[PDB]
Design a protein around this ligand. Structure first.
Ligand SMILES: [Cd+2]
Ligand SMILES: [Cd+2]
Ligand SMILES: [Cd+2]
Length: 28
């Protein structure tokens, strides 16, 4: 399935999801 940052870093706000592969944020 598609996680959150597959084409969008949404950590700066709340667009991410329960599958942050993007390490550009500070999800976990
Ligand atoms: Cd991100
Ligand atoms: Cd994310
Ligand atoms: Cd995130």
């Amino acid at each position: 399935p598609g996680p959150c940052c597959n084409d969008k870093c949404v950590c700066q706000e709340g667009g991410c999801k329960a599958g942050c592969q993007c390490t550009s944020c500070r999800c976990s």
